[PDB]
Every structure is written in C-alpha cells, then in structure tokens.
C-alpha cells in the first residue's frame, strides 16, 4: 500500500515533542505486551522484501541514468492496478528513492515453499516491466522521453549516484535542493511522499551539519590524491562550506541521505512461535549478520569511484547519522554555525545529551536474552540507555519486563523522533502503536525485533505475532540469486527454531562488531577471517576462533551447511545425509542449485556481484586506471546487468558470472 497522507513537522517545530512521543510510545509498547505477550503456537509465516532501481537506458548517448520520472507507478499499482497485484500475490511500496520500488509477496509464505519465492519475485519484476512498457507506449505518443528505455534492476548501489547526467531530468541544478542541500544529489532523487524530504531535512538540521560518509578509494596507479569531484558553492550556509573540512584524502566523499537510503537490499521477516522463541531466534542471528553481509557483497563503487570495500552498510549507516558533534565526541566543523556542537538539539535539553558511539543505523547493540544459554556478560560493549525508559519498562502496571528486554528498548530510545505528523500527536495508546513505530522504525539495525499490534491478542490466530527481520543482505541482480539467499536464511531460521534446545550461538557482542568492520573489506569473502563460535552444540561454551567464509560455510564442526542447512534438510526428509543428494532429487532439484550457488560463492569458486562489477570496471577498454567510473563504463556495466537479469547469454556474461553449470541450469529451467 501507499503511506497515508499528512503534514510533517520541521525539526525546529518537532523537537519540543520528543519527550511526549517517547513517553506515549512506551505506553503503547506496554499495551502491546499486555495484549500479545502470551501468543503461542504462532506458525512460521515469513516473507522477503526486494528493492529496485528504475534505470533509464539512453542507448543513443550511451548514458544509464536513474529514472526519476515514472514514479507514479507506485500510486497506480495501489489504485487502479491493485487488482493486477492481488490476483498475482504481490504488493508494492515506496522507498526513499524517487527511482526506487519496493515489492513483497501479498501474503507471507508458510514454512518451506520451494521455488515459489522465485516465482513471486519474478511476478513482482514482470508487473514493474509491464507498467514500464505501458508508460513507454504513452510516452511515445506524447513525444516524451525519446530514445529512452526504462528497466528495473535490483542493484545495491547506483555506481553513478550524484555524478553528472545521472538522473533523466534536463538541467536539475537550475533550482536549489533545499532538503538535502547536497553538492551532488538534487532533491529529485527523493520520493515525493512527505516523509522522505522530511527525514532528510530533520536529520540535517538536528545534526547541524550535512551527513558525511567517507569511503576509502580503490588505490589504482593514476588515482587522484583526493576526491576531485568536490567543488566549492554558495547556495547554502553552513553546508556548502562543510565539504572542504569534512572530506579526506584517498576517500570518496558523500554528503546526502540518498547516497545511503538510495541504496537497495534484500530483507527477510520470520514469525516465531512466540516472544521467547523470537528472542531466542534474534539473539542466534546476530553473528550471521556480519557474515551474510560479507558473503553477499554487491557494492564495490560509490559516486563514480571504485571503492576500497564491497558493501553498502557503512554508507547507509552514515547517511542517516543524526549524531551532533557533541554526541560524537568531536568539534563541529563550523563552530559559528554548529553552536558548541549541539546542532539543532533544544537549549533546554543539552544538559541531558549523551556521547553515543554508533549511528541510529548500525549493528544490533544488545542480545535480548531470556533463553537458557544467555548470560548478560555477552553484552560487553558500550551501549548508552534511556534510564527513564528502563525504569518504566521495569516498573509499571501493564507489563513489567525483564531487565535484558527492558535494556534493548531503553537503548533504542536514546534517539529523538525524526519525522512526525501534526495530525498524529495525540493517539489512543490502547489501539495505536504509531508513536512506538516512530522510534522502532528509525532504529535501523542488522536485525529488527518486531512486536506486533495491540490487536494481536492470542485468540486472533491470523494476526502477525512476534517477528524477527534479518536485514543485512545486499540485493542481487537475478531473482534466482535473491531466492537462493532468501531460502538460505529460511533454512537457517528453521534449523534454529527446530533445534532450540541444542543450539547455543552466543558470542561476545564486541566480536560481532569487529566482524561488521571486517565484512566491509574488498574481497573479504575470498580471504578475511571472522570470529565465529567454535561449536554450537555445547552449553556454556562461548569460545570463538577465526574462520574464513569458506570454513564458516563448510566446517563439519561449526559450519552453516553441516550444522544448520544439512541437519534441517535431513529432518524434513529432503535428504538422508547430505545437502548434495538434492542434485538428484525430483521434487527439489532447484534447491540444489540455490545451495550450490551459495556454496560456490562462499568458497571463491564463483564471484560476488561486487567482485564481478569490480572486474568489469577494471577490464573495461575505456577504464583510465584512475578508479573513475565514466558515463560510458557505467552504461555498459548496467547493460551487462540488464542482460544478466534477463538470463541472456548472447555475450557469454551469464556463463562468466554464474559458471557454465548454473548458467545452463537456470536458462534451461524456470521455477515451478
């Protein structure tokens, strides 16, 4: 569906409600516990979300741009084409990008659904393409977008974001971009739902400096010493003068929310049998996140530069980092504007400000605990909390919480609201969870623990229960890939839920955070090592050693395959002892190829999308050995991507990306 309409409050106007919003949200959370805390036997309903970028291929000029003009597609698919969607069990939603689409199945899958995930993804893609060709026909007859061809591509990152000629709008700088005030992204990159410009404005104002994300540059033989795309400008104060102080030699400089939230990923949500199992699951997935981040890398470039990392994560992390310099333990870049480092924080609350170590978009901070292997000492990192929120979740007449669970909520609640409508200031806290969602939904982490609504009382069997979202996977080009990774997480989750008495996955959170930095490094999948529990079938044992991705997927003692995937496939009867027996299964041949794709990438036999893009740029005739992605490199790159997305081996590129065996396999067999 669409986000329903409202008037956003600008930050200066909204900040005087921070405490009102937090208070009432907590009350709502208490009502939700009171009402749904006792749900049980909830079934394993689950679903993926994909995010797409509509690219306008201008073949005559050899230029691929983001198409910021067919954005009505999201309204049409939710009005007069909504019946197309439902008949097809798909659903479409807006995302940050004006050029982005988000789409999910219309109903959750129930337990194992084989190839249906891929089938449902393809339908999402076909309905998008269909709508695009309808616009192409209308456009033609009104002489609009001549020589343009729009295609939706599931790219993690647009390699030419905020570079010249990257959006299909003539002369986008002939007016100002008051929302982001970016040097590089005109505000037309932003979806027109008021929420998105608003979040963009509030975070910038609250911070009192532009968001800033410095990404190490790939260091090739002729690479400039600095990011020579930086220029000086005079539209905005303090912002146009920040760049020279915020940038750093040998780093791509990014300065706007759309560089981050203008990226795409694959997200998967699961419903646990009840809250306790949801905690158990969420805790167990914590260290899988850095690992699947590295394993799925798809983002080797930003703002036109080959980067020295392969994932989006830290970029999205900085793109919505509302921490004032005081909050980050640092001097403002421009002290006469950012007054004492408190940016836009109210004068009457500066005394209560905290040094906070991590962006509101960052890895899980705390295990929730509550299961037999948990021990509070595994939460061994710096996690500031809202003491007031802790107190009240601890001591209240609706649903008093255990201290570990109270601490998680208390940590999420150290942030202010960054987007609030005036209509909605006063809600009925027994029926509404909108204020809790304000803060829940703007703490973006590697997982999300999702309480349900106050309507989900245990007798409502069909309501959503307690859920866990697995958020780190970079999105891939092919529906085949994205289905594989969706099923991978599915099997891992099912393994975790079926074997809960036996699987102890606890490790010290600090190792996980370290894992999150390693997962960024260029070619991490191919040689880096990550702290990984040495055994799972083992009460009290929280020892790790350092293992490559290959070992992490394949070690008998503690690998993803022999300890998660294979065991659940045995017990469901898909195989008698090994995941590879599936090559010969009648019912399950496709599951073998998903797993083989996963196994082969985890061991370096086949390349990540990030790798394949890095190679392509490096081996391009026009590449100038300087790390720059030209209009023309970007065009062929995305043309390749387009063919790949479509299983088109006419140039041997699918065979080069997937290898012969999988390439033939997917060309010769549609999902059913």
- Residues at the contact surface with ligand GSH, assessed by CB under 6 A: 51, 95-96, 199, 261, 263-265, 312, 316, 441, 444
**Measured from the CB of residue 59, what is the shortest distance to ligand GSH in angstroms?**
29
Q: Which is nearer to ligand GSH, 51 or 58 (CB)?
A: 51
Which residue's CB is nearer to ligand GSH, number 199 or number 294?
199
| Min CB(261)–ligand GSH separation in Å | 5
- For ligand GSH, give the closer residue by CB, 93 or 241: 93
Which one, of 668, 667, 627, lies nearest residue 306 by Cα? Answer: 627
Q: Where are the alpha helices (DSSP H) in 237-285?
A: 242-246, 275-285
User: What's the min distance (Å) between Cβ of 403 and ligand GSH?
Assistant: 29
Give the distance, in angstroms, between the CA of residue 459 and the centroid of all CA atoms in the same chain. 33
Q: Which CB, 179 or 316, lies closer to ligand GSH?
A: 316
Cα separation, 665 vs 42, in Å, equals 37
Structure tokens belonging to residue 386? 């809202």
Residue 294 tokens read as 């590295």
Query: C-alpha 111: how far from its chain's center?
Result: 23
Residue with smaller CB distance to ligand GSH, 44 or 418: 418
HEC string for 415-433 = CCCCCCECHHHCCCCCCCC
Please give the Cα distance from 370 to 292 (Å, whole number).
Answer: 25
Report, in Å, the least distance between residue 433 CB and ligand GSH: 13
Quote the least distance from Cβ 267 to ligand GSH, whole Å. 7
199 versus 401: smaller Cβ distance to ligand GSH: 199
Distance CA 671, CA 91 (A): 20
Looking at the Cβ atoms of 42 and 51, the one nearer to ligand GSH is 51
Q: In the numeric block, which tokens belong to residue 149? A: 């061809």
| Cis amide bond preceding 238, omega within 30 | yes
**Residues preceding gaps in the chain (C to N > 2.5 Å):** none
Smallest gap from residue 626 Cβ to ligand GSH (A): 28
3-state helix, strand, coil in the chain (%, to 5): 40, 15, 45
Q: How far is the CB of 230 from ligand GSH (least distance, A)?
A: 26
Nearest CB to ligand GSH, comparing residues 266 and 568: 266
Relative orientation angle of helices 116-141 and 479-498, to the nearest 10 degrees: 150
- Smallest distance from the beta carbon of 95 to ligand GSH, in angstroms? 6
Rounded alpha-carbon distances, angstroms, from residue 598 to 143, 578, 589, 660, 666: 46, 15, 15, 15, 15
User: What are the beta bridge partners of residue 305?
Assistant: 302, 628
In 3D, which of 268, 257, 312 has the Cα closest to residue 448? 268
Residue 282 beta carbon to ligand GSH: minimum distance, rounded to whole angstroms: 17
Residue 309 gets the label, from left (phi > 0), alpha (psi -120 to 50) or beta, of beta
Spatial CA neighbour of 271 closest among 507, 519, 461:
461
Dihedral, 594, 596, 602, 606 alpha carbons, nearest 10: -100
Residues 448, 385: Cα–Cα separation, whole Å: 18
Nearer residue to ligand GSH within complex by CB, 152 or 567? 152
- Say how far apart CA 557 and CA 536 lie, in whole Å: 8
Residue 449 phi, psi dihedral angles, 5° rounding: -90, 115
Count CA atoms within 13 Å of residue 519 on its CB side.
29
Strand partners, 64: 57
Pick between residue 313 and residue 561 the one whose CB is nearest to ligand GSH.
313
How many CB atoms lie under 10 A from the CB of residue 462?
7
User: Which is closer to ligand GSH, CB of 197 or CB of 369?
Assistant: 197
**207 vs 277, which CB is nearer to ligand GSH?**
207
Question: What one-character DSSP code corresponds to residue 97?
Answer: B
Nearer to ligand GSH, 229 or 438 (CB): 438
Residue (45 or 444) nearer to ligand GSH, CB: 444
Query: Which residues make Cβ contacts (< 8 Å) with residue 329, sequence separation at least 6?
Result: 355
The residue sitting closest to ligand GSH, measured at its beta carbon, is 265
Round to whole Å and give the CA distance between 266 and 401.
32
Closest CB 234 distance from ligand GSH, rounded Å: 29
What's the rounded Cα separation, in Å, for the pair 578 and 628?
Answer: 46
Query: C-beta of 544: minimal distance to ligand GSH in Å?
Result: 26
Q: Rounded to whole angstroms, how far apart are CA atoms 74 and 81?
A: 10
Shortest distance, position 444 Cβ to ligand GSH, whole Å: 5
Tell me which residue has tokens 């008021």: 194
Contact 478, 646 (CB under 8 A): no
Output the smallest distance, CB 313 to ligand GSH, in A. 8
Least distance (Å) between residue 264 CB and ligand GSH: 6
Both tokens of residue 606?
């086949």
Min dist CB 601 to ligand GSH, Å, is 20
Distance in Å, CB of 104 to ligand GSH, minimum:
12
* Spatial CA neighbour of 207 closest among 243, 238, 248: 238
Residue closer to ligand GSH (CB basis): 91 or 558: 91
Q: Which is nearer to ligand GSH, 294 or 591 (CB)?
A: 294
């Amino acid at each position: 569906g669409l986000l329903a309409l409202g008037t956003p409050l600008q930050w200066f106007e909204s900040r005087t409600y921070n405490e009102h919003i937090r208070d009432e949200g907590i009350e709502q959370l208490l009502y939700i516990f009171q009402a749904a805390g006792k749900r049980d036997n909830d079934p394993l309903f689950w679903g993926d979300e994909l995010e797409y970028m509509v690219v306008d291929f201008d073949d005559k000029e050899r230029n691929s741009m983001l198409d910021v003009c067919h954005d009505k597609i999201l309204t049409e698919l939710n009005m007069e084409d909504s019946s197309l969607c439902e008949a097809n069990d798909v659903s479409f939603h807006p995302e940050y990008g004006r050029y982005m689409l988000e789409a999910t199945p219309a109903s959750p899958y129930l337990n194992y659904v084989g190839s249906y995930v891929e089938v449902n993804m393809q339908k999402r893609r076909a309905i998008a393409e269909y709508k695009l060709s309808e616009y192409a026909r209308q456009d033609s007859k009104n002489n609009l977008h001549v020589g343009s061809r729009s295609v939706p591509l599931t790219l993690t990152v647009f390699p030419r974001m905020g570079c010249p000629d990257f959006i299909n709008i003539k002369d986008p700088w002939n007016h100002k971009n008051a929302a982001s005030r970016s040097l590089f992204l005109p505000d037309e990159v932003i979806n027109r739902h008021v929420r998105f410009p608003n979040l963009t404005a509030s975070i910038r104002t609250r911070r009192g400096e532009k968001v800033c994300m410095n990404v190490p540059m790939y260091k090739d033989i002729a690479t400039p010493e600095t990011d020579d795309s930086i220029y000086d400008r005079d539209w905005f104060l303090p912002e146009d003068k920040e760049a020279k102080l915020a940038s750093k030699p040998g780093f791509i400089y990014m300065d706007s929310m759309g560089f981050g939230m203008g990226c795409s990923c694959l997200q998967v949500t699961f419903q646990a049998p009840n809250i306790n199992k949801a905690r158990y699951l969420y805790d167990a997935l914590v260290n899988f996140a850095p690992i699947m981040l590295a394993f799925s890398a798809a983002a080797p470039a930003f703002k036109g530069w080959l980067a020295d990392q392969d994932v989006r994560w830290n970029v999205i992390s900085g793109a919505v980092d509302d921490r004032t310099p005081k909050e980050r333990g640092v001097a403002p870049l421009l002290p006469k504007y950012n007054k004492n480092g408190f940016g836009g924080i109210a004068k009457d609350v500066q005394d209560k400000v905290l040094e906070i170590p991590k962006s509101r978009y960052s890895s899980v901070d705390l295990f929730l605990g509550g299961s037999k292997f948990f021990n509070r000492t595994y939460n061994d990192t710096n996690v500031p909390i809202n003491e007031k929120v802790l107190g009240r979740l601890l001591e209240n007449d609706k649903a008093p919480l255990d201290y570990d669970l109270a601490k998680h909520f208390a940590h999420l609640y150290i942030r202010d609201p960054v987007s609030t409508f005036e209509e909605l200031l006063n809600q009925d806290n027994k029926t509404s969870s909108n204020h809790f969602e304000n803060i829940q939904s703007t703490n973006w982490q590697t997982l999300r623990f999702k309480p349900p609504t106050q309507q989900a009382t245990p007798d409502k069997k069909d309501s959503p229960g307690w859920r866990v979202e697995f958020r780190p996977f970079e999105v891939q080009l092919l529906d085949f890939e994205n289905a594989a990774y969706s099923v991978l997480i599915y099997l891992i989750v099912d393994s975790i839920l079926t074997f809960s008495d036996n699987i102890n996955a606890y490790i010290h959170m600090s190792k996980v955070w370290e894992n999150m930095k390693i997962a960024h490094h260029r070619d991490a999948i191919l040689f880096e090592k990550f702290h990984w529990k040495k055994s799972f079938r083992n009460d009290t044992d929280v020892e790790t050693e350092d293992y490559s991705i290959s070992e992490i997927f394949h070690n008998p003692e503690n690998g993803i395959f022999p300890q998660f995937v294979t065991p659940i496939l045995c017990q469901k009867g898909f195989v008698t002892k090994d995941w590879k027996e599936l090559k010969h299964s009648s019912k399950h041949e496709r599951l073998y190829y998903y797993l083989k794709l996963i196994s082969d990438r985890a061991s370096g036999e086949l390349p990540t999308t990030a790798k394949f893009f890095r190679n392509f740029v490096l081996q391009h005739p026009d590449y100038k050995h300087d790390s720059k992605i030209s209009k023309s490199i970007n065009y062929d790159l995305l043309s390749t991507c387009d063919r790949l997305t479509h299983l088109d081996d006419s140039k041997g590129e699918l065979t080069s990306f997937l290898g012969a065996e999988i390439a033939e396999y997917v060309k010769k067999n549609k999902p059913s």
